[PDB]
Amino acid sequence: KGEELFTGVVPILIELDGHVNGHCFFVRGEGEGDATIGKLSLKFIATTGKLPVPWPTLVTTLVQCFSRYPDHMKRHDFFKSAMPEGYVQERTIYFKDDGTYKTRAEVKFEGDTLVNRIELKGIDFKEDGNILGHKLEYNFNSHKVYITADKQNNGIKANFTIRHNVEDGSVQLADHYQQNTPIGDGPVDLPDDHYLSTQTILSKDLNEKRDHMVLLEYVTAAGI
Ligand SMILES: [Cu+2]
Numbered sequence: 738k739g740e741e742l743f744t745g746v747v748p749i750l751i752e753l754d755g756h757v758n759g760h761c762f763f764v765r766g767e768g769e770g771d772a773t774i775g776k777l778s779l780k781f782i783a784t785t786g787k788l789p790v791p792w793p794t795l796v797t798t799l800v801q802c803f804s805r806y807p808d809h810m811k812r813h814d815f816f817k818s819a820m821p822e823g824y825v826q827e828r829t830i831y832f833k834d835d836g837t838y839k840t841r842a843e844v845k846f847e848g849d850t851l852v853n854r855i856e857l858k859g860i861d862f863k864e865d866g867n868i869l870g871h872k873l874e875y876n877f878n879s880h881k882v883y884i885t886a887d888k889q890n891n892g893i894k895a896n897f898t899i900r901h902n903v904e905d906g907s908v909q910l911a912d913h914y915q916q917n918t919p920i921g922d923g924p925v926d927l928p929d930d931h932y933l934s935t936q937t938i939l940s941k942d943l944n945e946k947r948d949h950m951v952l953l954e955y956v957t958a959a960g961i
Pocket of ligand 1: 754761
């Protein structure tokens with residue numbers, strides 16, 4: 738149960754509420770996810786206008802439940818087990834030599850649609866740094882999301898470090914710390930240590946005048 742909800746294409750809605758150094762923005766996302774192949778397709782819109790932060794910083798924050806979990810690994814899929822009731826996702830993202838994001842998100846089914854609603858607060862960002870000041874290349878590298886059971890929280894923790902390309906040639910690191918807890922009262926799947934290999938392509942809709950991001954992503958589970 739919960740597995741069944743992802744056999745096939747599921748519609749997605751993402752809403753992001755962001756406050757960074759007294760700036761504010763709202764991102765809205767739509768698209769489809771297909772967990773049997775591990776594919777997300779999504780168009781994001783800055784409803785509140787030109788962003789204060791580069792879109793790539795928002796990628797990890799802007800539905801890991803669409804992750805593809807192979808047949809032998811299926812008992813380790815915590816994300817889909819929390820469904821439909823869903824789960825909570827909290828992150829602390831440390832931008833090396835820069836500010837940090839704190840995020841809280843709820844991911845649950847709402848009728849037909851898989852919804853991810855997020856709150857993000859960003860403190861201590863250098864203005865004219867890589868993040869404020871927009872020095873990041875419009876792209877995304879491949880990453881492994883290391884997942885570990887968190888038994889006393891009835892959820893999971895995750896670690897990874899995002900490599901953001903800087904326009905001058907250097908890299909900007911972003912240490913992710915992650916925590917996921919169910920919204921309901923169980924029972925829930927708790928996995929052996931493993932990780933999610935992810936690949937991502939950021940593009941633009943050529944017809945679209947609003948500040949925005951089109952994203953296509955592939956995620957498969959591995960390590961067992
Ligand atoms: Cu707000």
